[PDB]
């Protein structure tokens, strides 16, 4: 009953929260070694070099709690010029959020604070809305955003993109990819009582050497043109299989055999649809529907974990980096303490470093956490 997505938005809440008293515990080791630094009764207990490093470790940390808000799992669609990648998105939106047919530009579906249905384009602030200036109009994007309330999905902070056909525009294939290198997880919509062309298979091959270990999903849509004869429909499907299984795992070589069976699925949007607008019968369409409805989860299942690492894995490393660094100042400074009755001057400048010390190996521990938590395996 729980959507997949939850890891995600979890892991979020984490790191940012980790981050933001990573700033707070930087900053104030930041003045320490500055207050003291400048002391002029003292000699060289903290170097003018530790306190430049620590100016530039919280300098950053702001940084990346900001871009730990912005913040996003991205799946892209691909096809030809309607398999359906109209619908497909349509679907597991629980609406017609974007039409069905058409032009080339790249269209994204963000998940909006705000009520109403919104729009906006490259290069500033004008908001226009939803299907107002869908006609409208080196690539080129314009972003849909649909509020809150209306999907799971956007909610759980996952966006959607939809791309021109692949059918009918070539331009090479990368400003094709400087907009899909923010994506996790790319979706082939192909179309069914026809065959798996190979001006699609061009995209994944060039994806496939441009990023690594892409997730790869493809999506089979229409299966109603070959419905109410069952295998009639058996056979269609295991070559289907054939052509596919052909490629994730043997051409691209995306991942195995096996779980191949987890990226290749038979379901037509169109039913997904209405069946999702109803909420206010051809044979096998709660077959097909529920089909739909477990390409749901393991996509989720998939596209969740997946982006937590891509995004995390060395904001996090890092962490632990810049925590590594302060511990051997915090070090650095208690000890050349210790190297009058200005006695307890460093016998204030004792234990201020094991705080600080403590201070640090407060947040090893959690970063530990996170790490076992959302990253598998420590």
Not at 310 to 336: C, G, P, W, Y
Request: with cysteine; hydrophobic share 40%; proline share 3%.
């Amino acid at each position: 009953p729980v959507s997949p997505l939850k890891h995600f938005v979890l892991a979020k809440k984490a790191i940012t929260a980790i981050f933001d008293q990573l700033l707070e515990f930087v900053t104030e080791g930041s003045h320490f070694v500055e207050a003291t630094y400048k002391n002029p009764e003292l000699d060289r207990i903290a170097t003018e070099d530790d306190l430049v490093e620590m100016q530039g470790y919280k300098d950053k940390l702001s940084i990346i709690g900001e871009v730990l808000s912005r913040r996003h799992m991205k799946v892209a669609f691909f096809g030809r010029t309607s398999s359906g990648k109209s619908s497909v998105i349509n679907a597991m939106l629980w609406d017609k959020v974007l039409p069905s047919g058409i032009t080339n530009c790249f269209l994204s579906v963000e998940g909006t604070d705000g009520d109403k249905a919104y729009l906006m384009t490259e290069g500033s602030d004008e908001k226009k809305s939803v299907k107002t200036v869908n006609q409208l109009a080196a690539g080129c994007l314009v972003r849909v955003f649909w509020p809150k309330a209306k999907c799971a999905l956007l909610r759980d902070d996952l966006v959607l993109v939809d791309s021109p056909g692949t059918d009918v525009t070539t331009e090479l294939d990368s400003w094709i990819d400087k907009f899909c290198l923010d994506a996790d997880v790319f979706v082939l919509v192909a179309n069914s009582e026809s065959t798996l062309m190979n001006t699609e298979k061009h995209f994944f091959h060039k994806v496939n050497e441009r990023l690594s270990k892409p997730n790869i999903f493809i999506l089979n849509n229409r299966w109603d043109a070959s419905a109410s004869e069952p295998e009639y429909m058996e056979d269609v499907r295991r070559q289907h299989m054939e052509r596919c299984l052909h490629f994730l795992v043997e051409e691209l070589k995306v991942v195995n055999a096996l779980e191949a069976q987890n990226r290749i699925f038979f379901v037509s949007a169109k039913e997904v649809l209405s069946a999702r607008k109803q909420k206010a019968l051809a044979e096998g369409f709660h077959a097909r529907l529920q089909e739909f409805q477990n390409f749901e989860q393991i996509f989720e299942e998939c596209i969740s974990q997946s982006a937590v690492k891509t995004k995390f894995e060395q904001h996090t490393i890092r962490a632990k980096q810049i925590l590594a660094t302060v511990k051997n100042i915090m070090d650095s400074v208690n000890l050349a303490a210790e190297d009058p009755k200005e006695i307890d001057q460093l016998e204030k400048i004792q234990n201020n470093s094991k705080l600080l010390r403590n201070k640090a190996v407060q947040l090893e521990n959690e970063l530990e956490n996170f790490t076992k938590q959302f990253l598998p395996s420590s």
